């Protein structure tokens, strides 16, 4: 359907091993989007092409206010092009470096928005897995948008991965709830609960669910994060309960 000659490329929005994402405008529509440029070259090299065509599937047949749209794709000789929705306010990663740490009302909100996106996703047996600040964009309304369904799956950094995944075990859609716990702690505190200097120490730390809270993290936050960060998937709340949690509700603007 689409082709490069249909677009006007603007400023780089960022990088990544496989190439860059650019702001871009569809010539005859004047529609603003983001062009994710991926070299076939490198996708083959690091054997991810099977992953890529899965990112396209899942994220394409997905439709949610809190999930970055993928409109389409195309290729030529040197590379593969993803036509992404453009999220005007950058990544939550950047906002977090910017503010270093969020407040309960902002955190609340993101968690909600996030919960909803994952609620919708699981319904379709889609499990994200790779939910980290770097992967969360912001709409003009300032609202969260889960990006990058690269690792995404049906039916590198350890920081966001739950015990089950890391240990090489049975994992379902509970992963995404552990992830939410980690996120939730990172937003309030400014670093993820299992941060360490080595792969090896992080592994232990996650493995044994060793986290502590700074004093300023309030009781309700401790509660929700404590319930989310369970070694055992079965004890992790359902998304519904996260939405229903009283620290969420007390604070979640959106
Ligand atoms: O796919 C990506 N990003 C995007 C996909 N869709 N939209 C983006 C995106 N939106 C952005 C918005 C901003 C807004 N800032 C621009 C500079 O001044 C401050 C505000 C920045 C980067 C964005 N990437 N990857 C890039 C992080 C490496």
Q: 3-class secondary structure for 37-57? A: EEEHHHHHHCCCHHHHHHHHH
**Looking up tokens 């404590």, which residue turns up?**
226
Asked about 223 being catalytic, the answer comes back as no
Q: Which residues are annotated as a binding site for ATP?
A: 17, 36, 85-87, 134-135, 148
CATH 3.30.200.20 in the chain is located at 2-90
Angstrom distance (rounded) from CA 188 to CA 203: 22
Q: Is 139 in the pocket of ligand 1 (CB under 6 A)?
A: no
CATH 1.10.510.10 in the chain is located at 91-252
Q: Which fold has domain 2-90?
A: Phosphorylase Kinase; domain 1 (3.30.200)
Q: Which fold has domain 91-252?
A: Transferase(Phosphotransferase); domain 1 (1.10.510)
53 CA distance to ligand 1 centroid (A)?
Answer: 23
Q: Return the HEC string of the chain.
A: CCCHHHEEEEEEEECCCCCCEEEEEECCCCCEEEEEEEEHHHHHHCCCHHHHHHHHHHHHCCCCCCECCEEEEEECCCEEEEEECCCCCCEHHHHHHHHCCCCHHHHHHHHHHHHHHHHHHHHCCCECCCCCHHHEEECCCCCEEECCCCCCECCCCCCCCCHHHHCCCCCCCCHHHHHHHHHHHHHHHCCCCCCCCCHHHHHHHHHCCCCCCCCCCCHHHHHHHHHHCCCCHHHCCCHHHHHHCHHHHHHCCC
Catalytic residue among 6, 76, 103, 130: 130
Q: What method did the depositors use to determine the structure?
A: X-ray
């Amino acid at each position: 359907q689409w082709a490069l000659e249909d677009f006007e490329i603007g400023r780089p929005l960022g990088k990544g091993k496989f190439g860059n994402v650019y702001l871009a405008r569809e010539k005859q529509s004047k529609f603003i989007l983001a062009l994710k440029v991926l070299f076939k070259a490198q996708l083959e090299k690091a054997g991810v092409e099977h992953q890529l065509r899965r990112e396209v599937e899942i994220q394409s047949h997905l439709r949610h206010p809190n999930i970055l749209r993928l409109y389409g794709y195309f290729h030529d000789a040197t590379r593969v092009y993803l036509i992404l929705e453009y999220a005007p306010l950058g990544t939550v990663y950047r906002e977090l470096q910017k503010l270093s740490k969020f407040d309960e009302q902002r955190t609340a909100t993101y968690i909600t928005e996030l919960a909803n996106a994952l609620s919708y996703c699981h319904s379709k047996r889609v499990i994200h897995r790779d939910i980290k600040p770097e992967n969360l964009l912001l709409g003009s309304a300032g609202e969260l948008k889960i990006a990058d369904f690269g690792w995404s799956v049906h039916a590198g950094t350890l920081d966001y991965l739950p015990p089950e995944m890391i240990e090489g075990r049975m994992h379902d859609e509970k992963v995404d709830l552990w992830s939410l716990g980690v996120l939730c702690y990172e937003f309030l505190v400014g670093k993820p609960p299992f941060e360490a200097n080595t792969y090896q120490e992080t592994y232990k730390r996650i493995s044994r669910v060793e986290f502590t809270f700074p004093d300023f993290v309030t009781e309700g936050a401790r509660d929700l994060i404590s319930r989310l960060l369970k070694h055992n998937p079965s004890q992790r709340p359902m998304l519904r309960e996260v939405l229903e949690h009283p620290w969420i509700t007390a604070n979640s603007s959106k």
